[PDB]
Amino acid sequence: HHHHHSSGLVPRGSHMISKINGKLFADMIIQGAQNLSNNADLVDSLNVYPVPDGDTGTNMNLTMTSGREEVENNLSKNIGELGKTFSKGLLMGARGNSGVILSQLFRGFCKNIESESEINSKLLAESFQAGVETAYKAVMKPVEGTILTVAKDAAQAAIEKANNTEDCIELMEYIIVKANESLENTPNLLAVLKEVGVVDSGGKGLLCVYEGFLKALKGEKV
Ligand SMILES: Nc1ncnc2c1ncn2[C@@H]1O[C@H](COP(=O)(O)OP(=O)(O)O)[C@@H](O)[C@H]1O
Ligand SMILES: [Mg+2]
Ligand SMILES: [Mg+2]
Ligand SMILES: [Mg+2]
Ligand SMILES: [Mg+2]
Ligand SMILES: [Mg+2]
């Protein structure tokens, strides 16, 4: 096969994340929230399904902001506890189809890690997948080409990649690539999107959250 490795040296470098504690998850929430808020007017204008009522971005932003506010007032090193705080804030602030779905995605994500103090890349992936399950079960009649589709494709990318990727930065980068591909495909699933010439507004809002998650993993601010 290969050279048998036996070196006592430990690999170098700083730009990698092995474990996510409660303050890194808080930073992901905060930066995700801020990135969404900065894009809310755009996400509103994209809204066409089920009605073109100009509100997806507002709805998602208000929902996410409720979660963020609870987090910022109640930080913890324990990721499971921080997730309970985030979940509660989303669920007591969910607005619209998109904000309800967002709160259910993150309810299932957070429930999956409730007893953890920190998570690794595999459990980050598993938590995205748990959130997709929760959200699909919450919606009586799921429709494809939507925030659900983008979340599901993102979580299956996460599962696959995490199996051989310990770095949560590299994992989240891949999740975003694959979530973007799914978002760009939404008009091929939901007719009104292709007729109007837009991607799904809920899916776009979710991408905005994920992009902020990556900024936080890199130790950066939106
Ligand atoms: N049945 C559904 N299945 C999946 N996603 C849905 C469904 N209904 C709505 N959505 C999502 O919600 C987004 C619209 O959110 P929003 O504008 O907040 O809804 P509304 O103003 O109709 O309450 C859609 O672009 C889509 O992502
Ligand atoms: Mg509405
Ligand atoms: Mg709307
Ligand atoms: Mg387990
Ligand atoms: Mg898929
Ligand atoms: Mg890197």
Side-chain angles (χ1 to χ4, degrees), residues 135-190:
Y136 268 85
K137 285 173 195 283
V139 176
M140 287 182 288
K141 295 191 171 185
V143 166
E144 296 295 324
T146 61
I147 191 173
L148 289 182
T149 308
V150 175
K152 181 187 70 213
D153 288 337
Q156 175 66 41
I159 290 291
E160 294 183 18
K161 184 66 166 176
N163 203 33
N164 51 66
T165 304
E166 172 187 355
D167 177 20
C168 295
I169 296 169
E170 181 181 353
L171 176 58
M172 193 76 214
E173 289 170 326
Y174 183 75
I175 294 171
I176 288 159
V177 168
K178 290 297 179 188
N180 276 306
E181 289 176 1
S182 180
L183 180 58
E184 293 199 12
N185 188 63
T186 57
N188 302 313
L189 288 158
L190 180 56

Side-chain angles (χ1 to χ4, degrees), residues 43-44 46-60 95-101 135-136 139-150 186 190 193 199-204:
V43 173
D44 277 350
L46 294 171
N47 186 195
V48 296
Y49 184 82
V51 180
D53 67 343
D55 65 358
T56 309
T58 301
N59 286 343
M60 294 181 76
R95 296 194 183 226
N97 284 303
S98 63
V100 172
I101 292 166
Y136 268 85
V139 176
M140 287 182 288
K141 295 191 171 185
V143 166
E144 296 295 324
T146 61
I147 191 173
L148 289 182
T149 308
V150 175
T186 57
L190 180 56
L193 300 180
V199 303
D200 186 66
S201 57
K204 182 61 172 176

Side-chain angles (χ1 to χ4, degrees), residues 23-36:
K23 183 51 161 64
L24 184 49
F25 188 35
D27 291 347
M28 294 163 69
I29 290 158
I30 293 162
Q31 302 316 311
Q34 186 64 49
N35 198 52
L36 175 64

